[PDB]
């Protein structure tokens, strides 16, 4: 069973915040996601949707605003593998979110929504989480 992991952020997140996600991509994984969302409602606007796609060998970044998706950005290749553990940082600055995978800077996603609207982090899909922490 895939069960979403939710972290409420009722005072939001400010520049200089680190979301640290550790887990395993299980053997039959298709894709999983890390979403920074504006509210608890299903289909909430998203400042960031980070979506490793093992099935298509891509990592997609997008936002959702006023109920519509933005233009996808892609990182280089896919630094995740079925059957292997990973660590991702998502780091908030004034300018955007930096994604770090393993020991490497991976992608910068410029803010599209104001960072102050973020209220929730949801991690789900085909992933077995070790831990999620927000600093």
Residue numbers in the entry: 1 to 135
Copied sentences from the primary study:
Galectins are members of the carbohydrate-binding lectin family with specificity for β-galactosides. Human galectin-7 (hGal-7) is a 15 kDa prototype galectin with a single CRD, monomeric but capable of dimerization in solution.
The high resolution (1.4 Å) structure gives an accurate insight into the molecular architecture of the protein with 99.3% of residues in the favoured Ramachandran plot area and 336 water molecules observed. The overall ‘jelly-roll’ fold is conserved compared with the previously obtained native and carbohydrate-bound complex structures. At the N-termini in particular molecule B presented some residual amino acids from the histidine-tag cleavage forming a tail lodging itself between two crystal-related symmetry molecules. The CRD itself remains unchanged despite a slight movement in the adjacent loop composed of Arg74 and Gly75. Molecule A had an unusual difference electron density around the buried thiol group (Cys38), which is not conserved among galectins.
